[PDB]
Design a protein around this ligand. Structure first.
Ligand SMILES: Cc1cc2nc3c(=O)[nH]c(=O)nc-3n(C[C@H](O)[C@H](O)[C@H](O)COP(=O)(O)OP(=O)(O)OC[C@H]3O[C@@H](n4cnc5c(N)ncnc54)[C@H](O)[C@@H]3O)c2cc1C
Ligand SMILES: Cc1cc2nc3c(=O)[nH]c(=O)nc-3n(C[C@H](O)[C@H](O)[C@H](O)COP(=O)(O)OP(=O)(O)OC[C@H]3O[C@@H](n4cnc5c(N)ncnc54)[C@H](O)[C@@H]3O)c2cc1C
Lengths: 972, 52, 125, 63
């Protein structure tokens, strides 16, 4: 009868201290309450410290990194699936640890997506490389075998696994009831086919678990855990419209299948940027009348989020509005490291999560308190393996009814056994991980971070160096004071580069208020030059050089910093321009605007260090020697259409910062943004006499670069045009002036079988098709090991089909138009050619207009790709592991050297690839694009560029000239 | 520039020597910007999140 | 200082960013007759220190000192494969600088010859 | 060939012997303790004594 609550929209990242100010007093407990808690918790920990344990014990016992634990568990699973145990035993004793280290690691991981891959003669004296080789060198081969057998007991006892969901479900069978609920492995569908597979796995799991649910009422029936990201391939805020229409009926269908067995059905909680969208999906699903008369629907809520308490209110109001009983899971949160990194990368104004562990612990207890008061409509489920958390929630419940605890199979066993001995009316639900091998790696990674974490209760309780009393410190006693709530050694994203410089601000698209305001602000927002006008511009810049070069470096730097301030102040105007004139999607435009401002502040800071004071040289007494750097003269700045603001400004402000005057010639397609930028620099403090804009064709550009009075050229663009510029400069009889040229690349990526295919697929889609492949760093050539090639190719193709191509101003668009008709024609010609020459894996449907859709071709060999193709077109070569050298040679042969991606778990392989190549930017286990100023100094060599790298510490000096002043001071 | 002494015999690491305009390209021999010109930069970016 | 260690770049948690400096390839070193030892060795040891291999062409008037210097470098630890001496005219110098496989030129000498070298470099594809 | 010794005697002599024995199995520098600590890589257990001293004047313990 009460109102359906409005769409959830709590503030994303409020101040930790204000929250601590309310949580600290309210956490107070009377001495007899604390005494009961202390006793209960001490007893639970004593039981924990009494079997054959968990992952944590294994990691601790062999002092394993998370990577090493991961490799052994993966090897363990493959060995458990060998038909004859004696075969496995033979392998372990005779092969494992003797050699073939990388082969064993690669094969066992490939086994997870391609079972046939896993089924030689090991030469002695093999150098121990790979994760297993390095492990063997450290512990010895016998210990590694012993560690692998322990991983086998862990994999066999604590996971319910199969090649397909049918095999897992058959394996986890008990006319008995299952003593376990199912934590299903799947997450993050990359393709439509993945979303159907996960849907069908959940549906199958629900029938299996239903047929063995026993005859009791909830809450004494099994549950299943479900992830929204598994059920939809573009589960993201910007795709909300399609998500509400596509995902809801799927989530509803599964909830109905669950209701029919009167099961507990729980929607897991994922990343903070998906909170709002998930609550939207969950609310619309719950609203359906087909779910009346069933008390098992529910969701997880993450207490590590500042928004958790508000989520609880929202969920309660949802339950009251639809008159339902909900089972609600309270967890701390599984994605902490991801949230920190994302907020930093995205330049957010704060963290959505707490940054001190004790604050999460405080908020968990506060949320448990709140949830307990919402009984009996809400049935709270406290998922935790922390003995203090358990003891504290138990005390606050003042009874044992109307709620349960939860744990994962392989964790908290001794804790909850003991809890049940000391409190016979206590309920706890145990979940088993259930699913396919192809979903294991993603799940193992997330699981291992926790059992390995030093702050983790489970790890600490297994470390006998840590006294029982230390495990029982109250969270409030660790914080002490509100202002201490935030972690002192974790800067806010705006301070990531402090005190060197300020960071530009970004926007969280997953916060609807933030995204709506940005979309709103943005929505609310040129004659060529004659060759005579270009020559007059040079002459006028030549005149302004004298005064600009002698303007103090601090004054020049202040103008750049004011330009950064004005760019960020007027971001909506510039983003609108980038979208309309550049054809850029909202994320790409915003990112370019940030990069533009980052260039200003970075060159400003490097400018003060470099030009701010002279360097004193050592020397004899009675003499001074000082080295300074002076502007060269007039620089000509030539910029491309693909980053028409940031590269335009990067090149210009560098030249200006070094004390040169500048004549800037933007690309023909994008003069309006160039003109706005120039007016902004003038407004920021760049004198009209130091900076001129000249627009027009290559004829105008050539007029500038042929001028005898210019002191240097900075150019970003085509390789052919750079050489013609270089020839025009070299032809002059005057001074040899510097040419700084950044040119294209045929950028490759190498992925081996240890790489997670879903992740590679994400990174390949992004790197090749983001900005319609119109980035100099874009992936053009993927090399993938043959054992995982079919799966990797299918996943990239399936993911590429999910990209929305269309009008860049629409928020849902992933791929905007290419820059002009001539670009589209060259791309379409390359596409037609490749269709007759190479296997076509994907050819997407383009809208009418200046659009080219993502294409994927497989080449027989890399040599079939001879040109840089500046569009959304991926070329793939599959290779054999032993033929990596052929791959490296193929990459060397092009002559280019801009970016290179490397995807592998194996540090020795990564390092061997880095050692071999001469590429300017190497990206390991992430995408290959979006170089950040002052973080990834960006620029290539060979056919890709001259150096120095833009956005790095060697750039500014190239725009300047050295001067030594030597004074005989002996007369003094 | 040499003030009140001779104009010759630049000392390595004391008077980084080299000209501009028609006299040279830079960087100065015997000075701190020389070696970098003979080399190329390489950035290695590693997503370390899986390790912790 | 420059090549001994990588420079760590600031960045987000969960990511490492390192800047290194690597040799470019084969440098052609062309030296004048007026400082036939010191400028010869300055240019050569700079290129070598940066991690390049070197083909050195001394001035036609002063090869004996160049050969002694090159021999001394070999003895000091420069592998024979990293450093070669080629003696002769301007025509030999032009053969070296027109070669498509070289990664850079370090030159001390006449203005006219520098431009001819610069034009030959720019002419390559 | 190797000879294995068993500690043999009366309870009244055990404490004095246990004390001396325990100092070694507990010592951080002890090979036995280190080899049982998997944080210590095999190569570290194989450092040659001469490589740890390096120079005569470093023979004495500095602290
Ligand atoms: C059955 C089950 C289902 C679960 N479902 C989900 C889910 O749907 N979504 C989800 O995100 N989590 C979920 N979790 C939680 C996650 O898997 C971890 O198990 C849980 O966070 C561990 O908390 P704790 O009380 O066991 O351990 P503890 O050792 O007490 O607590 C560790 C937790 O503290 C937090 N933390 C660590 N360091 C900091 C820091 N510096 N600042 C602030 N906080 C910090 C993290 O959340 C971390 O997980 C689930 C857990 C279980 C058992
Ligand atoms: C059967 C048997 C009988 C023994 N009988 C005797 C005996 O009669 N008298 C006796 O004194 N020992 C005796 N020992 C030796 C003693 O009991 C230890 O076992 C022995 O010293 C350990 O040496 P290691 O090669 O096993 O171990 P390691 O771990 O290699 O060596 C440890 C030894 O190094 C030395 N040491 C440690 N720190 C330092 C330091 N900072 N500076 C210099 N030296 C250091 C100590 O001697 C220490 O015992 C006997 C041992 C055995 C097995």
């Amino acid at each position: 009868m009460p109102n359906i609550p409005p769409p959830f929209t709590a503030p994303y990242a409020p101040d930790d201290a204000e929250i601590a100010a309310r949580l600290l007093p309210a956490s107070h407990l009377s001495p007899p309450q604390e005494a009961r808690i202390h006793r209960t918790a001490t007893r639970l920990i004593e039981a924990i410290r009494k079997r054959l344990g968990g992952v944590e014990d294994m990691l601790r016992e062999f002092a394993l990194s998370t990577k090493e634990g991961l490799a052994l568990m993966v090897l363990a699973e493959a060995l458990l699936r060998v038909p004859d145990a004696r075969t496995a035993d033979q392998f372990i004793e005779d092969k494992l640890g003797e050699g073939d280290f990388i082969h064993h690691e690669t094969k066992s991981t490939a086994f997870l997506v391609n079972a046939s891959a896993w089924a030689r003669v090991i030469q002695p004296g093999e150098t121990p490389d790979g994760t297993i080789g390095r492990l063997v060198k450290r512990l010895g081969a016998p210990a590694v075998r012993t560690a692998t057998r322990q991983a086998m007991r862990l994999m066999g006892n604590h996971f319910v696994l199969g090649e397909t969901i049918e095999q897992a479900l058959e394996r986890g069978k008990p006319g008995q009831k299952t003593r376990y609920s199912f934590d299903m492995l799947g997450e993050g569908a990359r393709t439509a086919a993945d979303a159907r597979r996960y849907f069908d796995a959940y549906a199958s799991a629900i029938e299996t678990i239903g047929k063995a649910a026993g005859n009791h009422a909830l809450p004494d029936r099994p549950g299943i855990s479900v992830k929204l990201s598994a059920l939809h391939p573009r589960f993201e805020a910007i795709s909300r419209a399609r998500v509400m229409v596509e995902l809801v009926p799927q989530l509803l269908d599964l909830a109905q299948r669950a209701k029919a067995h009167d099961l507990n059905f729980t929607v897991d909680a994922e990343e903070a940027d998906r909170l709002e969208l998930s609550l939207d999906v969950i609310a619309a699903t719950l609203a359906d009348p087909s779910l009346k008369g069933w008390d098992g629907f529910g969701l997880a809520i993450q207490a590590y989020q500042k928004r958790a308490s508000a989520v609880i209110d929202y969920v309660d109001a949802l339950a009251r509005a639809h008159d339902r009983k909900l089972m609600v899971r309270l967890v701390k949160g599984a994605y902490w490291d991801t949230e920190i990194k994302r907020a930093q990368e995205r330049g957010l104004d704060g963290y959505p999560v707490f940054t001190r562990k004790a604050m999460t612990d405080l908020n968990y207890v506060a949320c448990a308190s709140k949830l307990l008061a919402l009984r009996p409509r809400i049935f709270p489920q406290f998922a935790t393996h922390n003995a203090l958390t358990v003891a504290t929630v138990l005390e606050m419940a003042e009874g044992s009814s109307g709620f349960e605890f939860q744990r994962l199979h392989g964790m908290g066993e001794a804790l909850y056994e003991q809890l049940a001995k000391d409190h016979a009316d206590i309920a706890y639900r145990t979940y088993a991980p259930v699913g396919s091998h192809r979903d294991l790696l993603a799940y193992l990674v997330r699981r291992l971070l926790e059992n390995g974490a030093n702050s983790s209760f489970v790890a600490q309780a297994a470390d006998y160096r840590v006294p029982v009393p230390a495990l029982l410190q109250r969270p409030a006693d660790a914080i002490v004071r509100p202002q201490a709530a935030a972690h002192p050694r974790i800067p806010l994203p705006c301070d990531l580069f402090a005190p060197e410089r300020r960071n530009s601000r970004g926007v969280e698209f997953g916060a609807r208020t933030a995204l709506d305001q940005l979309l709103t602000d943005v929505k609310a927002e040129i004659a060529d030059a004659t060759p005579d006008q270009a020559h007059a511009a040079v002459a006028a810049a030549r005149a302004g050089f004298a005064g600009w070069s002698r303007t103090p470096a601090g004054i020049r730097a202040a103008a750049l910093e004011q330009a950064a301030h004005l760019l960020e102040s007027r971001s909506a105007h510039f983003i609108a321009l980038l979208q309309r004139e550049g054809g850029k999607t909202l994320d790409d435009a915003l990112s370019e605007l940030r990069e533009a401002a980052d260039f200003c502040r970075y060159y400003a800071a490097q400018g003060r260090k470099l030009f701010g004071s002279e360097t004193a040289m050592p020397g004899p007494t009675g003499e001074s020697n000082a080295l300074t750097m002076r502007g060269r003269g007039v620089f000509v700045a030539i910029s491309p259409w693909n980053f028409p603001l940031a590269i335009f400004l990067g090149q210009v402000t560098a030249a200006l910062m070094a004390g040169n005057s500048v004549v800037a010639k933007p690309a023909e397609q994008t003069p309006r943004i160039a003109r706005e930028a120039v007016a902004l620099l003038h407004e920021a403090g760049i004198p009209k006499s130091a900076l001129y804009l000249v627009t027009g064709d290559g004829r105008i550009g050539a007029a500038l670069t042929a001028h005898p009075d210019i002191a240097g050229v900075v150019f970003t663009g085509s390789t052919e045009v750079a050489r013609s510029i270089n020839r025009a400069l070299a032809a002059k009889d005057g001074p040899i002036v510097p040419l700084i040229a950044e040119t294209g690349g045929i950028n490759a990526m190498i992925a081996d079988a240890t790489a997670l295919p879903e992740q590679v697929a994400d990174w390949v889609v992004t790197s090749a098709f983001r900005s319609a492949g119109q980035r100099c760093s874009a992936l053009r050539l993927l090399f993938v090991q043959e054992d995982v090639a079919d799966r990797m190719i299918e996943m990239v193709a399936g993911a590429a089909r999910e990209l929305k191509i269309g009008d860049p101003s629409d928020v849902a668009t992933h791929v905007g138009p290419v820059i002009d008709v001539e670009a589209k024609q060259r791309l379409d010609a390359h596409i037609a050619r490749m269709k007759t020459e190479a296997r076509l894996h994907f050819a997407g449907p383009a809208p009418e207009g200046c659009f080219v859709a993502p294409h994927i071709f497989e080449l027989t060999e890399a040599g079939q790709l001879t040109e840089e193709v500046f569009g959304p077109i991926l070329h793939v070569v599959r290779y054999r592991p032993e033929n990596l050298e052929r791959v490296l040679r193929a990459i060397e042969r092009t002559g280019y050297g801009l970016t290179l991606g490397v995807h592998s778990r194996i540090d020795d392989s990564i390092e061997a690839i880095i050692d071999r190549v001469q590429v300017g930017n190497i990206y390991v286990n992430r995408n290959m694009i979006g170089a950040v100023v002052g973080v990834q100094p960006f620029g290539g060599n060979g056919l890709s560029g001259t150096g120095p790298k833009a956005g790095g510490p060697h750039y500014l000096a190239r725009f300047a000239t050295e001067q030594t002043v030597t004074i005989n001071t002996a007369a003094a | 520039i040499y003030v009140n002494r001779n104009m010759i015999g630049a000392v390595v690491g004391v008077q980084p020597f080299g000209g501009n305009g028609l006299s040279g390209t830079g960087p100065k021999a015997g000075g701190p910007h020389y070696l970098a010109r003979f080399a190329t930069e390489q950035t290695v970016t590693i997503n370390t999140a899986a390790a912790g």
